[PDB]
Amino acid sequence: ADYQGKNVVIIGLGLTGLSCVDFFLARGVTPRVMDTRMTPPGLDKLPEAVERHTGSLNDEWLMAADLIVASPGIALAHPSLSAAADAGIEIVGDIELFCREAQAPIVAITGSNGKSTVTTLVGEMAKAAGVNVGVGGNIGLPALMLLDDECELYVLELSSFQLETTSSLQAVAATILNVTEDFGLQQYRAAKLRIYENAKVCVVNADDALTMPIADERCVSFGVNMGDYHLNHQQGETWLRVKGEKVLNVKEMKLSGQHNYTNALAALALADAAGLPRASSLKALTTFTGLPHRFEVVLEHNGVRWINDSKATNVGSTEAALNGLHVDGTLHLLLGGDGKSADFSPLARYLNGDNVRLYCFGRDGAQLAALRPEVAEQTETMEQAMRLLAPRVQPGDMVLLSPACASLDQFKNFEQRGNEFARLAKELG
Protein backbone atom coordinates (compact mmCIF):
# COMPACT_ATOMS: atom_id res chain seq x y z
CA ALA A 1 0.00 0.00 0.00
CA ASP A 2 2.37 2.75 1.21
CA TYR A 3 6.05 2.01 0.60
CA GLN A 4 7.52 5.38 1.45
CA GLY A 5 10.93 5.35 2.97
CA LYS A 6 11.10 1.55 2.71
CA ASN A 7 14.37 0.09 1.46
CA VAL A 8 13.12 -2.08 -1.43
CA VAL A 9 15.14 -4.33 -3.65
CA ILE A 10 14.01 -5.95 -6.84
CA ILE A 11 15.32 -9.21 -8.13
CA GLY A 12 15.04 -9.56 -11.86
CA LEU A 13 15.76 -7.27 -14.78
CA GLY A 14 13.29 -8.67 -17.23
CA LEU A 15 10.01 -6.98 -18.06
CA THR A 16 8.37 -7.87 -14.73
CA GLY A 17 11.27 -6.43 -12.75
CA LEU A 18 11.24 -3.34 -14.92
CA SER A 19 7.52 -3.05 -14.34
CA CYS A 20 8.24 -3.07 -10.56
CA VAL A 21 10.98 -0.49 -10.88
CA ASP A 22 8.41 1.75 -12.62
CA PHE A 23 5.81 0.96 -9.94
CA PHE A 24 7.97 2.27 -7.08
CA LEU A 25 9.35 5.29 -8.91
CA ALA A 26 5.72 6.28 -9.55
CA ARG A 27 5.35 6.38 -5.88
CA GLY A 28 8.41 8.36 -4.85
CA VAL A 29 10.50 5.25 -4.17
CA THR A 30 13.86 4.48 -5.79
CA PRO A 31 14.27 0.73 -5.38
CA ARG A 32 17.55 -1.08 -6.01
CA VAL A 33 17.72 -3.85 -8.67
CA MET A 34 19.77 -6.95 -9.31
CA ASP A 35 19.80 -9.89 -11.77
CA THR A 36 21.99 -12.97 -11.76
CA ARG A 37 22.60 -12.63 -15.50
CA MET A 38 25.61 -10.57 -16.52
CA THR A 39 23.73 -8.71 -19.19
CA PRO A 40 20.08 -8.72 -18.48
CA PRO A 41 17.85 -7.50 -21.38
CA GLY A 42 16.32 -4.85 -19.14
CA LEU A 43 19.57 -3.15 -17.99
CA ASP A 44 19.20 -0.86 -21.06
CA LYS A 45 15.90 0.70 -19.83
CA LEU A 46 16.60 1.51 -16.26
CA PRO A 47 16.54 5.12 -15.03
CA GLU A 48 20.16 6.03 -14.18
CA ALA A 49 19.06 7.07 -10.71
CA VAL A 50 18.55 3.46 -9.73
CA GLU A 51 21.46 1.34 -8.57
CA ARG A 52 21.76 -2.03 -10.25
CA HIS A 53 23.82 -5.18 -9.72
CA THR A 54 24.29 -7.87 -12.31
CA GLY A 55 26.05 -11.15 -12.58
CA SER A 56 24.92 -12.25 -9.16
CA LEU A 57 22.66 -11.37 -6.24
CA ASN A 58 24.12 -8.60 -4.04
CA ASP A 59 23.60 -10.27 -0.62
CA GLU A 60 24.46 -7.07 1.20
CA TRP A 61 21.54 -5.41 -0.67
CA LEU A 62 19.13 -8.27 0.10
CA MET A 63 19.93 -8.42 3.81
CA ALA A 64 19.53 -4.69 4.25
CA ALA A 65 16.12 -4.44 2.50
CA ASP A 66 12.74 -3.78 4.07
CA LEU A 67 11.00 -5.29 1.08
CA ILE A 68 12.34 -7.72 -1.55
CA VAL A 69 10.33 -8.01 -4.78
CA ALA A 70 11.28 -11.25 -6.46
CA SER A 71 10.60 -12.12 -10.08
CA PRO A 72 8.81 -15.48 -10.43
CA GLY A 73 11.04 -18.27 -11.55
CA ILE A 74 13.56 -20.79 -10.27
CA ALA A 75 15.33 -17.76 -8.76
CA LEU A 76 12.76 -18.05 -5.95
CA ALA A 77 14.82 -21.01 -4.67
CA HIS A 78 18.16 -19.23 -4.55
CA PRO A 79 19.77 -19.66 -1.10
CA SER A 80 20.27 -15.89 -0.68
CA LEU A 81 16.50 -15.20 -0.88
CA SER A 82 15.93 -18.02 1.61
CA ALA A 83 18.34 -16.49 4.18
CA ALA A 84 16.65 -13.12 3.78
CA ALA A 85 13.46 -15.08 4.32
CA ASP A 86 14.92 -16.75 7.37
CA ALA A 87 15.81 -13.30 8.66
CA GLY A 88 12.18 -12.26 8.40
CA ILE A 89 12.57 -9.81 5.61
CA GLU A 90 9.32 -9.44 3.65
CA ILE A 91 9.39 -11.03 0.21
CA VAL A 92 6.62 -10.44 -2.35
CA GLY A 93 6.21 -10.62 -6.13
CA ASP A 94 4.64 -8.19 -8.64
CA ILE A 95 1.24 -9.98 -8.43
CA GLU A 96 1.20 -9.28 -4.69
CA LEU A 97 1.97 -5.57 -5.22
CA PHE A 98 -0.71 -5.63 -7.92
CA CYS A 99 -3.44 -7.09 -5.71
CA ARG A 100 -2.83 -4.66 -2.88
CA GLU A 101 -3.43 -1.85 -5.39
CA ALA A 102 -6.16 -3.11 -7.67
CA GLN A 103 -9.55 -1.28 -7.53
CA ALA A 104 -11.49 -3.72 -9.79
CA PRO A 105 -12.40 -7.35 -9.57
CA ILE A 106 -9.87 -10.03 -10.59
CA VAL A 107 -10.54 -13.30 -12.46
CA ALA A 108 -7.42 -15.45 -11.75
CA ILE A 109 -6.41 -18.36 -13.96
CA THR A 110 -3.79 -21.06 -13.65
CA GLY A 111 -3.25 -24.42 -15.21
CA SER A 112 -0.64 -26.48 -16.96
CA ASN A 113 -2.39 -26.39 -20.37
CA GLY A 114 -4.91 -24.10 -22.08
CA LYS A 115 -4.36 -21.25 -19.58
CA SER A 116 -3.55 -18.75 -22.35
CA THR A 117 -6.63 -19.47 -24.51
CA VAL A 118 -8.91 -19.44 -21.51
CA THR A 119 -7.47 -16.16 -20.20
CA THR A 120 -7.84 -14.68 -23.64
CA LEU A 121 -11.34 -16.01 -24.02
CA VAL A 122 -12.59 -14.40 -20.77
CA GLY A 123 -10.97 -11.18 -21.98
CA GLU A 124 -12.85 -11.56 -25.22
CA MET A 125 -15.97 -12.19 -23.15
CA ALA A 126 -15.38 -9.00 -21.22
CA LYS A 127 -14.84 -6.98 -24.36
CA ALA A 128 -18.01 -8.31 -25.93
CA ALA A 129 -19.76 -6.94 -22.85
CA GLY A 130 -18.43 -3.44 -23.26
CA VAL A 131 -16.32 -3.71 -20.14
CA ASN A 132 -12.93 -2.04 -19.87
CA VAL A 133 -10.91 -5.17 -19.18
CA GLY A 134 -7.21 -5.50 -18.37
CA VAL A 135 -5.68 -8.89 -19.37
CA GLY A 136 -2.15 -10.09 -18.64
CA GLY A 137 -0.12 -11.40 -15.75
CA ASN A 138 2.11 -14.33 -16.64
CA ILE A 139 1.12 -13.74 -20.26
CA GLY A 140 1.04 -10.53 -22.32
CA LEU A 141 1.71 -7.58 -20.06
CA PRO A 142 2.99 -8.02 -16.41
CA ALA A 143 0.03 -7.30 -14.11
CA LEU A 144 1.45 -4.05 -12.76
CA MET A 145 1.31 -2.58 -16.25
CA LEU A 146 -2.47 -3.19 -16.28
CA LEU A 147 -3.17 -1.02 -13.21
CA ASP A 148 -5.63 1.63 -14.31
CA ASP A 149 -8.23 3.51 -12.36
CA GLU A 150 -10.50 3.15 -15.37
CA CYS A 151 -10.09 -0.68 -15.62
CA GLU A 152 -13.40 -2.45 -14.74
CA LEU A 153 -12.17 -5.97 -14.52
CA TYR A 154 -8.77 -7.74 -14.47
CA VAL A 155 -8.07 -11.12 -16.01
CA LEU A 156 -4.70 -12.53 -15.02
CA GLU A 157 -2.88 -15.60 -16.00
CA LEU A 158 -0.87 -16.79 -13.00
CA SER A 159 1.95 -19.33 -12.73
CA SER A 160 3.03 -21.39 -9.76
CA PHE A 161 6.01 -19.20 -8.89
CA GLN A 162 3.74 -16.11 -8.93
CA LEU A 163 1.21 -17.76 -6.56
CA GLU A 164 4.08 -18.73 -4.29
CA THR A 165 4.73 -15.02 -3.49
CA THR A 166 1.16 -13.88 -3.49
CA SER A 167 -0.97 -13.61 -0.46
CA SER A 168 -3.55 -10.93 -0.85
CA LEU A 169 -5.28 -12.12 -4.02
CA GLN A 170 -9.03 -11.98 -3.58
CA ALA A 171 -10.30 -13.18 -6.97
CA VAL A 172 -13.86 -12.72 -7.96
CA ALA A 173 -13.37 -16.04 -9.86
CA ALA A 174 -10.43 -18.42 -9.80
CA THR A 175 -9.57 -21.69 -11.44
CA ILE A 176 -6.76 -24.26 -11.73
CA LEU A 177 -7.54 -25.57 -15.24
CA ASN A 178 -5.46 -28.68 -14.83
CA VAL A 179 -2.43 -30.01 -13.06
CA THR A 180 -0.32 -32.16 -15.43
CA GLU A 181 3.05 -33.86 -14.90
CA ASP A 182 5.46 -30.98 -15.57
CA PHE A 183 10.12 -29.32 -8.43
CA GLY A 184 7.79 -31.77 -6.63
CA LEU A 185 4.10 -31.74 -7.61
CA GLN A 186 3.15 -31.35 -3.99
CA GLN A 187 4.67 -27.95 -3.80
CA TYR A 188 3.65 -27.25 -7.37
CA ARG A 189 0.02 -28.06 -6.68
CA ALA A 190 -0.02 -26.32 -3.29
CA ALA A 191 1.21 -23.23 -5.10
CA LYS A 192 -1.62 -23.46 -7.62
CA LEU A 193 -4.22 -24.11 -4.92
CA ARG A 194 -3.59 -20.77 -3.36
CA ILE A 195 -5.30 -19.15 -6.30
CA TYR A 196 -8.49 -20.17 -4.47
CA GLU A 197 -7.94 -18.61 -1.10
CA ASN A 198 -10.40 -15.79 -0.67
CA ALA A 199 -11.79 -16.35 -4.12
CA LYS A 200 -15.47 -15.48 -4.35
CA VAL A 201 -16.17 -18.39 -6.68
CA CYS A 202 -13.92 -21.40 -7.38
CA VAL A 203 -14.08 -23.03 -10.79
CA VAL A 204 -12.56 -26.49 -10.90
CA ASN A 205 -12.10 -29.25 -13.40
CA ALA A 206 -14.61 -32.06 -12.87
CA ASP A 207 -12.15 -34.39 -14.71
CA ASP A 208 -9.01 -33.43 -12.73
CA ALA A 209 -9.15 -33.85 -8.91
CA LEU A 210 -5.86 -31.96 -8.46
CA THR A 211 -7.67 -28.73 -9.48
CA MET A 212 -9.89 -28.90 -6.46
CA PRO A 213 -9.47 -26.84 -3.23
CA ILE A 214 -8.75 -29.80 -0.92
CA ALA A 215 -14.28 -28.96 -1.99
CA ASP A 216 -13.68 -26.86 1.07
CA GLU A 217 -15.66 -23.98 -0.57
CA ARG A 218 -18.45 -25.50 -2.73
CA CYS A 219 -17.00 -24.79 -6.19
CA VAL A 220 -18.56 -24.44 -9.63
CA SER A 221 -17.25 -27.11 -11.97
CA PHE A 222 -16.71 -27.70 -15.69
CA GLY A 223 -15.94 -31.02 -17.35
CA VAL A 224 -16.72 -33.25 -20.34
CA ASN A 225 -19.65 -35.41 -19.21
CA MET A 226 -20.34 -34.12 -15.72
CA GLY A 227 -20.31 -30.79 -13.93
CA ASP A 228 -22.14 -27.45 -13.81
CA TYR A 229 -20.70 -26.70 -17.24
CA HIS A 230 -20.30 -29.80 -19.41
CA LEU A 231 -20.65 -31.19 -22.90
CA ASN A 232 -23.72 -33.00 -24.16
CA HIS A 233 -24.22 -35.07 -27.28
CA GLN A 234 -27.88 -35.73 -28.18
CA GLN A 235 -29.99 -35.93 -31.35
CA GLY A 236 -27.02 -35.61 -33.75
CA GLU A 237 -25.71 -32.45 -32.09
CA THR A 238 -23.23 -31.56 -29.31
CA TRP A 239 -24.26 -28.79 -26.86
CA LEU A 240 -22.60 -26.82 -24.13
CA ARG A 241 -24.76 -27.28 -21.00
CA VAL A 242 -24.90 -25.04 -17.95
CA LYS A 243 -26.78 -26.22 -14.84
CA GLY A 244 -28.66 -28.69 -17.02
CA GLU A 245 -29.78 -26.22 -19.72
CA LYS A 246 -28.49 -26.15 -23.30
CA VAL A 247 -26.79 -22.86 -24.05
CA LEU A 248 -24.89 -23.25 -27.33
CA ASN A 249 -24.72 -25.86 -30.11
CA VAL A 250 -20.99 -26.36 -30.42
CA LYS A 251 -21.26 -25.80 -34.18
CA GLU A 252 -21.64 -22.08 -33.65
CA MET A 253 -18.09 -21.80 -32.38
CA LYS A 254 -15.03 -21.49 -34.69
CA LEU A 255 -12.84 -23.54 -32.38
CA SER A 256 -13.57 -27.22 -32.51
CA GLY A 257 -12.14 -30.26 -30.68
CA GLN A 258 -12.92 -31.41 -27.09
CA HIS A 259 -10.03 -29.50 -25.63
CA ASN A 260 -11.46 -26.24 -27.01
CA TYR A 261 -14.98 -27.11 -25.82
CA THR A 262 -13.70 -27.55 -22.24
CA ASN A 263 -11.77 -24.31 -22.62
CA ALA A 264 -14.99 -22.64 -23.74
CA LEU A 265 -16.94 -24.12 -20.79
CA ALA A 266 -14.20 -22.95 -18.32
CA ALA A 267 -14.19 -19.40 -19.65
CA LEU A 268 -17.93 -19.38 -19.64
CA ALA A 269 -18.02 -20.39 -15.98
CA LEU A 270 -15.44 -17.80 -15.03
CA ALA A 271 -17.28 -15.13 -17.04
CA ASP A 272 -20.59 -16.04 -15.34
CA ALA A 273 -18.85 -16.07 -12.01
CA ALA A 274 -17.36 -12.60 -12.65
CA GLY A 275 -20.84 -11.28 -13.47
CA LEU A 276 -20.50 -10.70 -17.26
CA PRO A 277 -23.74 -11.04 -19.28
CA ARG A 278 -24.25 -14.65 -20.44
CA ALA A 279 -25.38 -13.74 -23.96
CA SER A 280 -22.38 -11.50 -24.66
CA SER A 281 -20.10 -14.20 -23.27
CA LEU A 282 -21.79 -16.77 -25.54
CA LYS A 283 -21.43 -14.33 -28.44
CA ALA A 284 -17.66 -14.18 -27.92
CA LEU A 285 -17.50 -17.99 -28.14
CA THR A 286 -18.95 -17.83 -31.65
CA THR A 287 -16.44 -15.21 -32.83
CA PHE A 288 -13.21 -16.26 -31.07
CA THR A 289 -10.61 -17.10 -33.78
CA GLY A 290 -7.93 -18.48 -31.48
CA LEU A 291 -4.39 -17.56 -30.35
CA PRO A 292 -1.45 -17.82 -32.84
CA HIS A 293 -0.78 -21.43 -33.86
CA ARG A 294 -3.42 -22.76 -31.48
CA PHE A 295 -6.32 -23.88 -33.61
CA GLU A 296 -6.00 -20.44 -35.12
CA VAL A 297 -8.36 -19.71 -37.94
CA VAL A 298 -6.14 -17.75 -40.28
CA LEU A 299 -8.67 -17.70 -43.17
CA GLU A 300 -12.42 -18.33 -43.79
CA HIS A 301 -13.33 -17.87 -47.48
CA ASN A 302 -15.17 -19.77 -50.34
CA GLY A 303 -16.85 -21.71 -47.56
CA VAL A 304 -13.52 -23.20 -46.43
CA ARG A 305 -11.91 -22.62 -43.04
CA TRP A 306 -8.09 -22.70 -42.69
CA ILE A 307 -6.81 -23.62 -39.20
CA ASN A 308 -3.22 -23.27 -38.09
CA ASP A 309 -2.55 -25.70 -35.22
CA SER A 310 1.30 -25.80 -35.46
CA LYS A 311 1.57 -25.72 -31.66
CA ALA A 312 0.36 -29.33 -32.00
CA THR A 313 3.79 -30.93 -31.98
CA ASN A 314 2.77 -34.30 -30.55
CA VAL A 315 0.09 -36.94 -30.87
CA GLY A 316 -1.67 -35.78 -27.71
CA SER A 317 -2.09 -32.29 -29.11
CA THR A 318 -3.31 -33.45 -32.50
CA GLU A 319 -5.68 -35.83 -30.64
CA ALA A 320 -7.28 -32.96 -28.67
CA ALA A 321 -7.92 -31.36 -32.05
CA LEU A 322 -9.48 -34.35 -33.89
CA ASN A 323 -11.68 -35.61 -31.11
CA GLY A 324 -14.88 -33.60 -31.47
CA LEU A 325 -13.59 -31.90 -34.62
CA HIS A 326 -16.56 -30.40 -36.43
CA VAL A 327 -16.42 -30.40 -40.23
CA ASP A 328 -19.37 -30.01 -42.64
CA GLY A 329 -17.53 -31.42 -45.66
CA THR A 330 -13.97 -32.75 -45.85
CA LEU A 331 -11.05 -32.34 -43.44
CA HIS A 332 -7.76 -31.91 -45.25
CA LEU A 333 -5.50 -32.75 -42.24
CA LEU A 334 -1.88 -31.64 -42.74
CA LEU A 335 0.53 -33.93 -40.85
CA GLY A 336 4.32 -33.19 -40.91
CA GLY A 337 7.76 -32.62 -39.37
CA ASP A 338 9.95 -34.69 -37.06
CA GLY A 339 7.98 -37.04 -34.82
CA LYS A 340 10.97 -38.26 -32.80
CA SER A 341 9.92 -41.94 -33.13
CA ALA A 342 6.35 -41.64 -31.70
CA ASP A 343 3.23 -43.92 -31.98
CA PHE A 344 0.62 -42.28 -34.22
CA SER A 345 -1.80 -45.25 -33.84
CA PRO A 346 -3.92 -43.13 -31.50
CA LEU A 347 -4.60 -40.68 -34.36
CA ALA A 348 -5.83 -43.33 -36.76
CA ARG A 349 -9.08 -43.93 -34.89
CA TYR A 350 -9.95 -40.37 -35.88
CA LEU A 351 -9.39 -40.90 -39.64
CA ASN A 352 -12.22 -43.17 -40.91
CA GLY A 353 -15.53 -42.86 -42.79
CA ASP A 354 -14.85 -41.41 -46.28
CA ASN A 355 -14.85 -37.66 -45.33
CA VAL A 356 -11.12 -37.43 -44.54
CA ARG A 357 -7.93 -36.73 -46.45
CA LEU A 358 -4.38 -36.74 -45.17
CA TYR A 359 -1.58 -34.82 -46.85
CA CYS A 360 1.57 -36.03 -45.13
CA PHE A 361 4.97 -34.39 -45.42
CA GLY A 362 8.25 -33.77 -43.63
CA ARG A 363 10.82 -36.19 -42.30
CA ASP A 364 8.35 -38.79 -40.99
CA GLY A 365 5.69 -38.16 -43.66
CA ALA A 366 5.86 -41.74 -44.96
CA GLN A 367 4.88 -43.11 -41.52
CA LEU A 368 1.93 -40.83 -40.76
CA ALA A 369 0.87 -41.37 -44.38
CA ALA A 370 0.92 -45.07 -43.54
CA LEU A 371 -1.49 -44.24 -40.70
CA ARG A 372 -3.82 -44.93 -43.66
CA PRO A 373 -2.13 -44.87 -47.11
CA GLU A 374 -5.63 -45.22 -48.65
CA VAL A 375 -6.68 -41.53 -48.13
CA ALA A 376 -3.08 -40.41 -47.55
CA GLU A 377 -0.76 -38.50 -49.92
CA GLN A 378 2.95 -37.71 -49.41
CA THR A 379 5.25 -34.73 -49.93
CA GLU A 380 8.69 -33.49 -48.76
CA THR A 381 7.54 -30.05 -47.73
CA MET A 382 4.37 -28.37 -46.42
CA GLU A 383 4.03 -25.94 -49.41
CA GLN A 384 3.65 -28.96 -51.72
CA ALA A 385 0.64 -30.33 -49.82
CA MET A 386 -0.80 -26.84 -49.70
CA ARG A 387 -0.68 -26.44 -53.49
CA LEU A 388 -1.63 -30.08 -53.66
CA LEU A 389 -4.91 -29.75 -51.73
CA ALA A 390 -6.02 -26.26 -52.76
CA PRO A 391 -7.85 -27.31 -56.02
CA ARG A 392 -9.53 -30.17 -54.12
CA VAL A 393 -11.27 -28.11 -51.42
CA GLN A 394 -14.86 -26.89 -51.73
CA PRO A 395 -17.35 -25.20 -49.31
CA GLY A 396 -17.90 -26.85 -45.95
CA ASP A 397 -14.27 -28.04 -45.90
CA MET A 398 -11.60 -27.30 -43.32
CA VAL A 399 -7.84 -27.20 -43.94
CA LEU A 400 -6.05 -28.23 -40.79
CA LEU A 401 -2.38 -28.07 -39.94
CA SER A 402 -2.11 -30.30 -36.80
CA PRO A 403 1.49 -31.62 -37.33
CA ALA A 404 1.36 -34.10 -34.37
CA CYS A 405 5.10 -33.69 -34.80
CA ALA A 406 7.95 -31.29 -34.12
CA SER A 407 9.34 -28.75 -36.62
CA LEU A 408 13.07 -28.59 -37.24
CA ASP A 409 13.98 -30.51 -40.36
CA GLN A 410 12.76 -27.50 -42.40
CA PHE A 411 11.55 -24.77 -40.02
CA LYS A 412 13.05 -22.67 -37.26
CA ASN A 413 10.17 -23.31 -34.84
CA PHE A 414 6.45 -24.17 -34.94
CA GLU A 415 5.87 -20.39 -35.20
CA GLN A 416 7.68 -20.41 -38.56
CA ARG A 417 5.77 -23.46 -39.79
CA GLY A 418 2.52 -21.78 -38.75
CA ASN A 419 3.31 -18.32 -40.05
CA GLU A 420 4.03 -19.77 -43.44
CA PHE A 421 0.86 -21.89 -43.37
CA ALA A 422 -1.03 -18.64 -42.85
CA ARG A 423 0.88 -16.97 -45.65
CA LEU A 424 0.36 -19.85 -48.07
CA ALA A 425 -3.33 -20.01 -47.06
CA LYS A 426 -3.62 -16.34 -48.07
CA GLU A 427 -2.98 -17.14 -51.73
CA LEU A 428 -3.61 -20.88 -51.88
CA GLY A 429 -6.90 -20.04 -50.18
Side-chain angles (χ1 to χ4, degrees):
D2 169 56
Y3 300 100
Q4 276 312 302
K6 290 274 197 161
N7 170 333
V8 332
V9 318
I10 296 163
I11 299 168
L13 256 173
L15 190 71
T16 305
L18 247 21
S19 89
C20 300
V21 172
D22 172 273
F23 173 93
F24 291 103
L25 291 190
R27 295 165 173 60
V29 181
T30 302
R32 286 206 276 199
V33 181
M34 65 188 61
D35 193 277
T36 52
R37 290 169 305 188
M38 187 58 253
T39 306
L43 189 61
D44 264 349
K45 310 155 191 207
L46 225 49
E48 29 292 302
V50 329
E51 319 164 53
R52 56 280 244 139
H53 183 100
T54 49
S56 52
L57 293 190
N58 185 317
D59 296 290
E60 196 267 306
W61 285 19
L62 285 179
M63 292 330 267
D66 292 312
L67 181 60
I68 295 173
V69 180
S71 295
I74 322 179
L76 280 174
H78 188 121
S80 301
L81 239 201
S82 177
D86 292 25
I89 288 167
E90 189 174 20
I91 299 166
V92 310
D94 68 320
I95 273 29
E96 171 67 25
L97 300 165
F98 178 83
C99 298
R100 295 159 175 194
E101 299 312 331
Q103 298 315 285
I106 312 169
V107 169
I109 298 173
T110 191
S112 305
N113 290 99
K115 203 193 322 175
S116 294
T117 286
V118 174
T119 302
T120 293
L121 206 34
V122 178
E124 294 313 279
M125 279 167 183
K127 304 192 206 294
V131 335
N132 186 15
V133 61
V135 191
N138 187 60
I139 247 61
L141 295 178
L144 290 183
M145 306 185 59
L146 304 180
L147 279 172
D148 189 327
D149 272 334
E150 293 296 300
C151 191
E152 309 173 327
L153 170 72
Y154 295 107
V155 186
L156 307 176
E157 193 225 75
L158 310 158
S159 76
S160 278
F161 292 121
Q162 294 182 304
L163 296 155
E164 233 113 24
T165 55
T166 311
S167 52
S168 53
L169 165 67
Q170 293 189 321
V172 68
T175 179
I176 296 172
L177 295 163
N178 41 67
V179 183
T180 75
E181 307 81 353
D182 177 22
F183 311 92
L185 230 197
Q186 227 100 253
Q187 331 304 67
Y188 177 71
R189 194 201 169 211
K192 274 176 202 305
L193 285 155
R194 38 198 313 175
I195 201 178
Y196 299 128
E197 303 172 359
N198 296 307
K200 186 177 294 170
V201 167
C202 296
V203 181
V204 303
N205 191 327
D207 303 311
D208 190 351
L210 296 196
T211 66
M212 312 189 53
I214 268 190
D216 209 2
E217 244 168 309
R218 297 294 109 183
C219 315
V220 170
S221 69
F222 69 91
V224 178
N225 301 318
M226 293 198 50
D228 295 276
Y229 292 67
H230 72 259
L231 300 181
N232 172 218
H233 187 99
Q234 40 164 268
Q235 319 202 281
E237 292 299 349
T238 287
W239 304 74
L240 295 187
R241 302 205 77 133
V242 172
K243 283 191 161 191
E245 299 74 8
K246 287 179 171 178
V247 283
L248 191 76
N249 183 312
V250 282
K251 287 175 174 164
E252 295 190 45
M253 291 181 45
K254 306 280 180 63
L255 299 217
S256 171
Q258 187 183 99
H259 176 57
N260 286 324
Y261 301 140
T262 36
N263 293 328
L265 288 171
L268 184 58
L270 289 169
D272 285 350
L276 297 173
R278 166 68 63 65
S280 46
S281 291
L282 284 180
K283 172 61 196 191
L285 285 187
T286 65
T287 76
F288 192 51
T289 57
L291 284 193
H293 316 107
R294 283 162 288 234
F295 209 92
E296 177 186 39
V297 61
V298 302
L299 183 75
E300 186 177 78
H301 188 22
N302 298 157
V304 303
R305 193 174 284 167
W306 301 68
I307 291 68
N308 165 0
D309 197 36
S310 269
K311 183 77 177 63
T313 56
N314 65 87
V315 176
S317 292
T318 286
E319 175 171 40
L322 298 178
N323 187 181
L325 181 58
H326 174 226
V327 197
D328 289 356
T330 308
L331 160 68
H332 302 266
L333 181 61
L334 282 167
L335 303 189
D338 167 45
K340 307 174 296 181
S341 301
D343 172 44
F344 307 122
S345 170
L347 292 177
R349 305 192 293 81
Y350 293 121
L351 329 166
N352 57 316
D354 67 55
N355 304 311
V356 186
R357 286 291 319 184
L358 315 179
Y359 295 70
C360 312
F361 65 91
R363 187 146 304 182
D364 302 281
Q367 309 187 58
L368 291 157
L371 192 65
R372 191 189 179 186
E374 143 74 66
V375 300
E377 192 92 313
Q378 202 174 327
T379 58
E380 178 205 311
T381 62
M382 178 193 274
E383 70 186 58
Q384 279 176 287
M386 228 81 94
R387 187 63 74 158
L388 176 52
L389 58 78
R392 315 194 176 187
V393 318
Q394 31 174 191
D397 293 346
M398 166 185 280
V399 182
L400 172 50
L401 162 58
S402 266
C405 303
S407 171
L408 297 178
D409 52 39
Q410 41 209 174
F411 308 98
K412 178 164 299 193
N413 43 41
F414 84 66
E415 285 84 320
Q416 198 174 56
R417 191 223 272 145
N419 264 231
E420 283 179 44
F421 174 84
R423 182 173 303 301
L424 296 106
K426 310 304 185 180
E427 62 171 287
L428 277 288

